[PDB]
CSV table of C-alpha atoms and ligand atoms in Angstrom, one decimal:
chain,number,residue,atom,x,y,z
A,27,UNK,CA,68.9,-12.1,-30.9
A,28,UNK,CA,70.0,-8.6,-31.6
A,29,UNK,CA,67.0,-8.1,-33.5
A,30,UNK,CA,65.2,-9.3,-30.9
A,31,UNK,CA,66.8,-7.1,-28.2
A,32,UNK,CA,66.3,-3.7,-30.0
A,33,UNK,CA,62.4,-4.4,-30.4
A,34,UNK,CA,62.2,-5.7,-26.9
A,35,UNK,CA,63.6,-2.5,-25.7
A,36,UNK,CA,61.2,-0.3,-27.9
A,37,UNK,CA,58.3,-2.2,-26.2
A,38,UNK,CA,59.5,-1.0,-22.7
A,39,UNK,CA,60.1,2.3,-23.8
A,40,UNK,CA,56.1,2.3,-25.0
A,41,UNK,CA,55.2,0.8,-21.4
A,42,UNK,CA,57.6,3.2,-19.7
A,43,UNK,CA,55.9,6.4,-21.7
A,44,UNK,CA,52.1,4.2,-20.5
A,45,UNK,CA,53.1,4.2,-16.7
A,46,UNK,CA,54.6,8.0,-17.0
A,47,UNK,CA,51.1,9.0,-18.2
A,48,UNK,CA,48.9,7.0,-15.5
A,49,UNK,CA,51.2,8.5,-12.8
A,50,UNK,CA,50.6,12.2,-14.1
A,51,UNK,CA,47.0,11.6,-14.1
A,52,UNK,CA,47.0,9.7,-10.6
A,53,UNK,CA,48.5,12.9,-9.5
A,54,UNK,CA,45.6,14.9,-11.1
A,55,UNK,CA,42.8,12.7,-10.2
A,56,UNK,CA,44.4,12.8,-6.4
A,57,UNK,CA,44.1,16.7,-6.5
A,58,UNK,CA,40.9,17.1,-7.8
A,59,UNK,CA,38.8,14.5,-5.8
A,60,UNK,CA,40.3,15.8,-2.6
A,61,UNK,CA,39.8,19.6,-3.7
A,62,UNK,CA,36.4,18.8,-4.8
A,63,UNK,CA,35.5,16.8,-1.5
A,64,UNK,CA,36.2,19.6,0.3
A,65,UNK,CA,34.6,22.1,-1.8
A,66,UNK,CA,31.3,20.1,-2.3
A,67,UNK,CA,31.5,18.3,1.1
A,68,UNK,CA,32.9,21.2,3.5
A,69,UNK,CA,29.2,23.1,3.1
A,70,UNK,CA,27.7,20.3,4.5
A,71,UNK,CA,29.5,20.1,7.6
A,72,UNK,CA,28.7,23.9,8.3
A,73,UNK,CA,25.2,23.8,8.0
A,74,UNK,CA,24.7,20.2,10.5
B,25,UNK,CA,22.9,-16.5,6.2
B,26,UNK,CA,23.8,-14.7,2.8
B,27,UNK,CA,25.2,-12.0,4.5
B,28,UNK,CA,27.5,-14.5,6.1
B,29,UNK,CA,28.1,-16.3,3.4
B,30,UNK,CA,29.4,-13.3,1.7
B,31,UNK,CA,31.7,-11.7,5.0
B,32,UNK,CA,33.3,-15.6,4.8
B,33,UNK,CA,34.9,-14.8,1.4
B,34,UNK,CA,36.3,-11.0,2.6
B,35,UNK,CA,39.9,-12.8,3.0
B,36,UNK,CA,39.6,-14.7,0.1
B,37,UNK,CA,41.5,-12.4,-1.5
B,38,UNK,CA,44.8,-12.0,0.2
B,39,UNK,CA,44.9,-16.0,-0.8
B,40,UNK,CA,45.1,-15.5,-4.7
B,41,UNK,CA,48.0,-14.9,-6.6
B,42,UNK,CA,48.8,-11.9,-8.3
B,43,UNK,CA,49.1,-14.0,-11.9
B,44,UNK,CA,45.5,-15.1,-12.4
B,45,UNK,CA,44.7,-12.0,-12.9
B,46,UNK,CA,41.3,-12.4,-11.1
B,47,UNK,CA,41.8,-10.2,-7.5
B,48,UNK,CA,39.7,-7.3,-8.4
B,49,UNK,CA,37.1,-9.3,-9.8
B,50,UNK,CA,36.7,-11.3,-6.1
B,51,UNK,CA,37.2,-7.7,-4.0
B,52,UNK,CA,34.9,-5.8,-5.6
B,53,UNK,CA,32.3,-8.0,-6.1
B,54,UNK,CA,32.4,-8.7,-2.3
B,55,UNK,CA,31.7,-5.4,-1.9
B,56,UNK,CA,29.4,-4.5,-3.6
B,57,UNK,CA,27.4,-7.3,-2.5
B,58,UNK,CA,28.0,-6.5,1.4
B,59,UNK,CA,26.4,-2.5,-0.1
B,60,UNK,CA,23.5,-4.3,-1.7
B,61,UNK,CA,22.3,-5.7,1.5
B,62,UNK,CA,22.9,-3.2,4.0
B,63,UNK,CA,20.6,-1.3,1.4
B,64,UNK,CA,18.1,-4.0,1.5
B,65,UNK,CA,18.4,-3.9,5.6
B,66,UNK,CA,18.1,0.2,5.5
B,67,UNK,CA,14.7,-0.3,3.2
B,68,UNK,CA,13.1,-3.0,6.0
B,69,UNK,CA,14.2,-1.2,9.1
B,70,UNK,CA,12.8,2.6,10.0
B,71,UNK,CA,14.7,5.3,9.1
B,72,UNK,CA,15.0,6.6,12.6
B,73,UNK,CA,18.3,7.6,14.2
B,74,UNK,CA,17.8,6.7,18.5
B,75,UNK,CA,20.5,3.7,17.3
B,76,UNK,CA,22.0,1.3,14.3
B,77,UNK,CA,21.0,-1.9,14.0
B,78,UNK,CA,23.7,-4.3,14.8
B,79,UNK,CA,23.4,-6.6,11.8
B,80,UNK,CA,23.9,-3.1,9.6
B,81,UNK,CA,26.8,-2.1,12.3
B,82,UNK,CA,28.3,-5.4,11.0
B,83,UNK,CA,27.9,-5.1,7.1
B,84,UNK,CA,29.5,-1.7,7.4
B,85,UNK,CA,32.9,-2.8,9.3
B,86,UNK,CA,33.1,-5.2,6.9
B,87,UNK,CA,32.5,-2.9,3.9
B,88,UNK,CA,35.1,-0.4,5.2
B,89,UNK,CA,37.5,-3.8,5.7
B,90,UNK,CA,37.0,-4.9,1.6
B,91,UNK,CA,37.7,-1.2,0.7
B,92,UNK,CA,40.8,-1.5,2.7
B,93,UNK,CA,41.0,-4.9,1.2
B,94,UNK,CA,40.8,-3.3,-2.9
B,95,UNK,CA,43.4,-0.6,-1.8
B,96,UNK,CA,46.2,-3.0,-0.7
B,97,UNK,CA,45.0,-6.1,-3.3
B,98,UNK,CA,45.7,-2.7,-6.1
B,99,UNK,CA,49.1,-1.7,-4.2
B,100,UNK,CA,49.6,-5.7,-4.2
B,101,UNK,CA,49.3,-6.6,-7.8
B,102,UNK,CA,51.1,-2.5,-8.7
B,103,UNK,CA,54.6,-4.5,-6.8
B,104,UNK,CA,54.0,-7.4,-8.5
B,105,UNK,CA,54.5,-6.2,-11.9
B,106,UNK,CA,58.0,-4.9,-11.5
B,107,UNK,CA,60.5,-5.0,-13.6
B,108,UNK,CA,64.3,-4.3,-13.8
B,109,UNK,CA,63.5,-1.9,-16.8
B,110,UNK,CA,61.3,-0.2,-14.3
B,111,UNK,CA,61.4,0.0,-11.0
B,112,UNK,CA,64.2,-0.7,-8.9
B,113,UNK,CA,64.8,-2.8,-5.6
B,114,UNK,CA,66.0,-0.3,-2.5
B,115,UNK,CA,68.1,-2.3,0.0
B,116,UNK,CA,66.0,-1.8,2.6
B,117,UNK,CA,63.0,-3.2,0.8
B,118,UNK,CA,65.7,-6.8,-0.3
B,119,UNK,CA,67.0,-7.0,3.6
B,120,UNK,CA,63.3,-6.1,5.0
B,121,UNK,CA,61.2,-8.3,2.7
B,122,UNK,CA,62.9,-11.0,1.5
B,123,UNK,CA,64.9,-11.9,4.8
B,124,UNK,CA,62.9,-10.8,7.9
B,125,UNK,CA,60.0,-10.6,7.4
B,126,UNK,CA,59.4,-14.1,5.5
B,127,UNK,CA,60.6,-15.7,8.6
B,128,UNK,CA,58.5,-14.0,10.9
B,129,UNK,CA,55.2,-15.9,8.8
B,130,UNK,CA,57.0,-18.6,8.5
B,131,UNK,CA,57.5,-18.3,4.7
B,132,UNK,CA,61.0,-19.4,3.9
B,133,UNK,CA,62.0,-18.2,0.7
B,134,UNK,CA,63.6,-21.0,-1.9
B,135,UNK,CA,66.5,-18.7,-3.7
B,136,UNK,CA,67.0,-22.1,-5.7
B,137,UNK,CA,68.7,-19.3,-7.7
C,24,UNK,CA,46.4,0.6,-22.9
C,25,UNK,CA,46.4,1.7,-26.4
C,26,UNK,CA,49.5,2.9,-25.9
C,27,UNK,CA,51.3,0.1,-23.6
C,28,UNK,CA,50.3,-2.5,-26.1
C,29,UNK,CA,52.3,-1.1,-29.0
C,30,UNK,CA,55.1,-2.5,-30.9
C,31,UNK,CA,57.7,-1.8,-33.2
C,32,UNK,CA,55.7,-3.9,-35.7
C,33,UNK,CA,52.5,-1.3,-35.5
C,34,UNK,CA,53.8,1.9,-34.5
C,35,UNK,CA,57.0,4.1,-34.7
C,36,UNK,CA,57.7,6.4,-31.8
C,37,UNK,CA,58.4,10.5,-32.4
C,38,UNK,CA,60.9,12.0,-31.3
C,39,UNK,CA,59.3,14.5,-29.6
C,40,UNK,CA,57.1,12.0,-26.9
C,41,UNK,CA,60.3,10.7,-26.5
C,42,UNK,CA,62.3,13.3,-25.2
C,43,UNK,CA,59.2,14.8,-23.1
C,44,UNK,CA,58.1,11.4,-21.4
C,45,UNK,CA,61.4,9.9,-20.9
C,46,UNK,CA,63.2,13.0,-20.0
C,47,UNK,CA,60.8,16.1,-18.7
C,48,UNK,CA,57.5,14.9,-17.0
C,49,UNK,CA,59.0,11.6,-15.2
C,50,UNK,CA,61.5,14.1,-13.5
C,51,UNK,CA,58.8,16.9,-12.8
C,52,UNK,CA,56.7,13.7,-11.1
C,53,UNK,CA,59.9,12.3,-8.8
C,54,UNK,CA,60.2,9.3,-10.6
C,55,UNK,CA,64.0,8.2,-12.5
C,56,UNK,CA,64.6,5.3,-14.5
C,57,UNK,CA,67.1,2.4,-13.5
D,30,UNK,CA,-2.8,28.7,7.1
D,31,UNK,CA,-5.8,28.3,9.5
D,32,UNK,CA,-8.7,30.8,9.2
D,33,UNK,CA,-12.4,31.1,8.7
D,34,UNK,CA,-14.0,30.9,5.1
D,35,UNK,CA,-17.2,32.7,5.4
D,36,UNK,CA,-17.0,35.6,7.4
D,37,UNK,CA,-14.3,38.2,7.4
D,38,UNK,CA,-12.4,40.4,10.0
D,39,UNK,CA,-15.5,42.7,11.3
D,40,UNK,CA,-17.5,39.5,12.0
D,41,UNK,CA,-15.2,36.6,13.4
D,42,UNK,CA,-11.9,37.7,14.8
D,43,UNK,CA,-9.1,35.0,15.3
D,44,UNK,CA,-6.7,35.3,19.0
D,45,UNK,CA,-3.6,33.8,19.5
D,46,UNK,CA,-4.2,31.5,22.5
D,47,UNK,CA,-0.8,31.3,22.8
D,48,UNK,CA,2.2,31.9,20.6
D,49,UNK,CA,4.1,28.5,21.1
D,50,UNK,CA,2.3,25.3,19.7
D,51,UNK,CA,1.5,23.0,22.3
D,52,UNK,CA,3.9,19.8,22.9
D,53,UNK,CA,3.2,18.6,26.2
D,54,UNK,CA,1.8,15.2,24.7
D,55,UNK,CA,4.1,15.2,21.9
D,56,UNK,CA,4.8,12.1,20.5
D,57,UNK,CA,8.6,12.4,19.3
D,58,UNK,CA,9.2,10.0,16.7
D,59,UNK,CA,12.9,9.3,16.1
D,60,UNK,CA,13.4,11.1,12.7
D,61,UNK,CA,12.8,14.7,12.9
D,62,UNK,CA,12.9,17.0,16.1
D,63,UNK,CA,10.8,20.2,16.0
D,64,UNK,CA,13.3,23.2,16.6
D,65,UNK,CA,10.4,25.9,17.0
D,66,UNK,CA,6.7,25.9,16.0
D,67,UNK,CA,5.2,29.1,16.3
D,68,UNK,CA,1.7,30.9,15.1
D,69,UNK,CA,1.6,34.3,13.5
D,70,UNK,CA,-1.4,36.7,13.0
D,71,UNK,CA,-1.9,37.8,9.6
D,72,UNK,CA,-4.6,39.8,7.8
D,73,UNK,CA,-5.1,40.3,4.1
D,74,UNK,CA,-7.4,41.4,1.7
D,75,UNK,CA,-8.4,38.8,-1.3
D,76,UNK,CA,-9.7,39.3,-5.3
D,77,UNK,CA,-12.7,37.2,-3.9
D,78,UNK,CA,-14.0,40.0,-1.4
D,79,UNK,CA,-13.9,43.1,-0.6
D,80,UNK,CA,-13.6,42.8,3.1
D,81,UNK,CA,-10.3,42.0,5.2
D,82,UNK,CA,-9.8,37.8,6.0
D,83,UNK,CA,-7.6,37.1,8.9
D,84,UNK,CA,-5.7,33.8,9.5
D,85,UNK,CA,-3.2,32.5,12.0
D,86,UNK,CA,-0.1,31.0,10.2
D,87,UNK,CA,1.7,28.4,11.8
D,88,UNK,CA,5.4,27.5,10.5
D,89,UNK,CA,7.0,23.7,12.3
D,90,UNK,CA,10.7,24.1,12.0
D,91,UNK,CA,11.7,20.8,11.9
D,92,UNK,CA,15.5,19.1,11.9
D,93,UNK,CA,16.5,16.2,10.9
D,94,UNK,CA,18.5,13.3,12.4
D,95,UNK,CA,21.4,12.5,9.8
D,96,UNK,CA,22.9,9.4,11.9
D,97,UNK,CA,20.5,7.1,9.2
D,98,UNK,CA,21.3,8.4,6.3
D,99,UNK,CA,24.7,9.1,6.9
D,100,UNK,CA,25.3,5.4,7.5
D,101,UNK,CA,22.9,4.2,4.7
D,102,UNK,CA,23.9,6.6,1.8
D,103,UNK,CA,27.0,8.8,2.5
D,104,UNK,CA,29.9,6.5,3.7
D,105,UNK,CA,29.2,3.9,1.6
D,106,UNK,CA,29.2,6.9,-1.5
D,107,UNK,CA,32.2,7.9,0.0
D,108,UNK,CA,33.8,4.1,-0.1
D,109,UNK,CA,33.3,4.1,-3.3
D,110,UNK,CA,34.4,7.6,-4.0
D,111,UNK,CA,38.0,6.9,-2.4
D,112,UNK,CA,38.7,3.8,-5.6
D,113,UNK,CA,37.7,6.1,-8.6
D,114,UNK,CA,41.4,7.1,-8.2
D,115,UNK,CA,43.4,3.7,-8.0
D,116,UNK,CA,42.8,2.9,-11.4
D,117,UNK,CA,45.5,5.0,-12.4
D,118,UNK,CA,48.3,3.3,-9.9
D,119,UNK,CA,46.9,-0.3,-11.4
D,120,UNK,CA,49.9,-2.3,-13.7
D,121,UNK,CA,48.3,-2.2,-17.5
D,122,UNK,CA,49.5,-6.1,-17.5
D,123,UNK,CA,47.1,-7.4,-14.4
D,124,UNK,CA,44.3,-6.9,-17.0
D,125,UNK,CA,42.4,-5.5,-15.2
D,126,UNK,CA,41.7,-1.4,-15.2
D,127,UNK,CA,38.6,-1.5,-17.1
D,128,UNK,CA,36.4,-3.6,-14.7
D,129,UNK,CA,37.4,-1.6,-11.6
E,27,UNK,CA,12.9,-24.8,-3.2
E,28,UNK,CA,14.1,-22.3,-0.7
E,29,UNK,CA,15.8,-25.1,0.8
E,30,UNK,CA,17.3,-26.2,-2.1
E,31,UNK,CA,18.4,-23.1,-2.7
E,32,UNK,CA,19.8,-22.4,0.2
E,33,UNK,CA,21.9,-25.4,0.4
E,34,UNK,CA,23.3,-24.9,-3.5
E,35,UNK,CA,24.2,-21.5,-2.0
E,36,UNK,CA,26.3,-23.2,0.4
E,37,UNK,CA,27.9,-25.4,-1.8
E,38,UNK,CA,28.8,-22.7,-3.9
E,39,UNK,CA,30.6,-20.7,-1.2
E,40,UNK,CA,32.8,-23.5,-0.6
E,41,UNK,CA,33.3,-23.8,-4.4
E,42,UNK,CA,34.5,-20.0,-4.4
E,43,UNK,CA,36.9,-21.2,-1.3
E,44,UNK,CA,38.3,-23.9,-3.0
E,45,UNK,CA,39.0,-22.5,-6.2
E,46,UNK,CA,40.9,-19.9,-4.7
E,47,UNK,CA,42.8,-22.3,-3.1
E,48,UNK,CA,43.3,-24.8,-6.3
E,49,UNK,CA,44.4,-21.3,-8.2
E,50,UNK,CA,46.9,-20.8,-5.4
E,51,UNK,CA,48.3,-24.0,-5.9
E,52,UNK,CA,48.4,-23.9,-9.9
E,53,UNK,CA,50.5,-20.6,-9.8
E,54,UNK,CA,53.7,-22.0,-7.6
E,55,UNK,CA,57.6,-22.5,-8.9
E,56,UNK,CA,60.8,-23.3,-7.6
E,57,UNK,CA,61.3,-19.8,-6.9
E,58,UNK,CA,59.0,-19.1,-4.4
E,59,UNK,CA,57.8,-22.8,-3.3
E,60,UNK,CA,59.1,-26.3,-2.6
E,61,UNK,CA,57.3,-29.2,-3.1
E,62,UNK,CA,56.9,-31.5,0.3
E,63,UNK,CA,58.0,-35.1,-0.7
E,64,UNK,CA,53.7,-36.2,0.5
E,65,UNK,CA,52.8,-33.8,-1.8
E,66,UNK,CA,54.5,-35.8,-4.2
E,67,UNK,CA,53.9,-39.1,-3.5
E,68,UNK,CA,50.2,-38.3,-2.4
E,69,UNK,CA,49.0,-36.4,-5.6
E,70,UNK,CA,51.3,-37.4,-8.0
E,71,UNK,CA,50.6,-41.1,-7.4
E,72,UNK,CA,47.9,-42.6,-5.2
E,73,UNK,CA,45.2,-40.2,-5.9
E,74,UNK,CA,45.5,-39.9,-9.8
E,75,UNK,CA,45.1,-43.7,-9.6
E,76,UNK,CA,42.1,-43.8,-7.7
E,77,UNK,CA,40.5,-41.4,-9.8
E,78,UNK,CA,41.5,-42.0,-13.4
E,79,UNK,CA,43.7,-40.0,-14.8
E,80,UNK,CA,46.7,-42.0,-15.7
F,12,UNK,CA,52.7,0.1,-41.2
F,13,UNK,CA,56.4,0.5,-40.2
F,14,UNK,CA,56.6,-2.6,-42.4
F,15,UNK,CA,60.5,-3.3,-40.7
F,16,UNK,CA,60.5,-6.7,-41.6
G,7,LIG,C1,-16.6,34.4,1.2
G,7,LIG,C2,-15.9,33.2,0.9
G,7,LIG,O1,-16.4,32.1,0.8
G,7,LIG,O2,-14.6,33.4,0.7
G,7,LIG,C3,-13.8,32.2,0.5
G,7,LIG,C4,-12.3,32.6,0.2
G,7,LIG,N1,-11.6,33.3,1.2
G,7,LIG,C5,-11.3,32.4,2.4
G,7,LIG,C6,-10.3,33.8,0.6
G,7,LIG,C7,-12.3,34.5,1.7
């Protein structure tokens, strides 16, 4: 059971570091598609 | 009458439990079905502006509802995979969801345990 | 995924990406551990 | 471009009749509005001949009417735009990141 | 052929309907359901007989 | 391969 303890908590760490890396790039992904809307979309709106 | 068919499976979703593992598949195949045949409908009609055909009107309510629909059915499934090792429970969230709210829809929660 | 499906019996985990991603960039992002 | 083929400025001479092109029995078809439609007087001289050719130019200004393709192309573009992002806030158990 | 089509279309649709709702019913525990004593006695006895399945 | 067991 010990053994089976320390392994268990090297999986979550490898999950843990998996869900730190989707959140960093959730942030990203959030930044850019609204910057680019706006840069790409804003023209739009100007000339209509 | 497929364009029925297909709105009549829109809630479908909100039905199936997180541990099939099969939401996304239903939600977005709803819409992208719904999007094929408002594009079928915007190749028949004229592409005039004087006014929207109501049958199109329709298909894009309900495409705006199953994008809602994927957004929650995502935020959905993201709670249900929670763990101690995690995430952890706020109060607010124990005294909110697991108490009031249940008994507003008439959910009554077991706590066998 | 690659990474979430690993396991002591496959991989070993350095140091460093320990110290970073538990310690640095889930703080910078507003997120703590239990 | 409207102008005579055969016979050059000192021979045939073109008038505006009037600078506006008529639309009092416009037909107005739902797609495109005219915003200004206007004829302009040009002369020039071509490789062909050695005489001056004029020509009355006409340029149709035309808008158009976004509501259909608005409706038809961009919002449904842009519903599909907003879940590019939520694959990144799906649980790597629910299996399923790589279809969305 | 349309008609037939049309109809197996149908039939379908209430197939999707009903999976869902067979699905919903496969996934359910203590924890978060209790099991109505004519649930019991309905699908855990009379209809299994009738259909077999012993 | 770690190899731990
Ligand atoms: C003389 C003659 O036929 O000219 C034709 C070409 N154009 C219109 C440029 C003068």
């Amino acid at each position: 059971l010990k053994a089976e303890d320390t392994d268990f908590s090297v999986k979550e760490d490898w999950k843990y570091v998996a869900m730190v890396i989707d959140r960093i790039f959730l942030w990203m992904f959030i930044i850019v598609c609204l910057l680019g809307t706006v840069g790409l979309f804003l023209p739009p709106w100007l000339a209509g | 009458i497929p364009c029925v068919l297909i709105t009549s499976l829109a809630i479908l979703v909100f039905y199936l439990p997180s541990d099939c593992g099969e939401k996304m598949t239903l939600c977005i195949s709803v819409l992208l079905a719904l999007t094929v045949f408002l594009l079928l409908i915007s190749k028949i009609v004229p592409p005039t502006s004087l006014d929207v055909p109501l049958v199109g009107k329709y298909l894009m309510f309900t495409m705006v509802l199953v994008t809602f629909s994927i957004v929650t059915s995502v935020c959905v499934l993201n709670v249900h995979h929670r763990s101690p090792t995690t995430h952890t429970m706020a109060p607010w969230v124990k005294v909110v969801f697991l108490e009031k709210l249940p008994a507003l829809l008439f959910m009554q929660q077991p706590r066998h345990h | 995924l690659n990474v979430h499906h690993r396991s002591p019996r496959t991989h070993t985990m350095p140091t460093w990406v320990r110290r970073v991603f538990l310690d640095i960039v889930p703080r910078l992002l507003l997120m703590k551990r239990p | 471009k409207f102008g005579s083929w055969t016979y050059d400025k000192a021979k045939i001479d073109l008038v505006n009749m009037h600078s506006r092109v008529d639309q009092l029995d416009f037909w107005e078809s739902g797609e495109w509005v005219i915003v200004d439609a206007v004829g302009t007087y040009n002369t020039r001289k071509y490789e062909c001949c050695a005489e001056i050719y004029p020509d009355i130019t006409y340029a149709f200004v035309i808008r158009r009417l976004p509501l259909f393709y608005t409706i038809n192309l961009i919002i449904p573009c842009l519903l599909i735009s907003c879940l590019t992002v939520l694959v990144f806030y799906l649980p790597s158990e629910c299996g399923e990141k790589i279809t969305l």
